[PDB]
């Protein structure tokens, strides 16, 4: 039961197109994201 699926939207100002990055290994919240992690 997948209620939500990823699509493309032309509008940009909506909050529905906002994502967050969760590292696989625990890292501090004030660290620079490596390019290839």
């Amino acid at each position: 039961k997948m209620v939500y699926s990823l699509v493309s939207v032309p509008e940009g100002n909506d909050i529905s197109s906002i994502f967050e990055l969760d590292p696989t290994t625990l890292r501090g919240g004030d660290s620079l994201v490596p390019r290839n992690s």
Partner: protein, 39 residues
């Protein structure tokens, strides 16, 4: 004064975990209050 290493590191860490939890609360001040106002 090389013994001051352990003397000052305890102070540094005791200050910094409090600073980072306060900074996490500050990060909440933005991220939580961003999604609170309605549309």
């Amino acid at each position: 004064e090389s013994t001051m290493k352990l003397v000052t590191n305890l102070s540094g860490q005791l200050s910094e975990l409090k600073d980072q939890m306060t900074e996490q609360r500050k990060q909440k001040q933005r991220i939580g209050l961003l999604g609170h106002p309605p549309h």
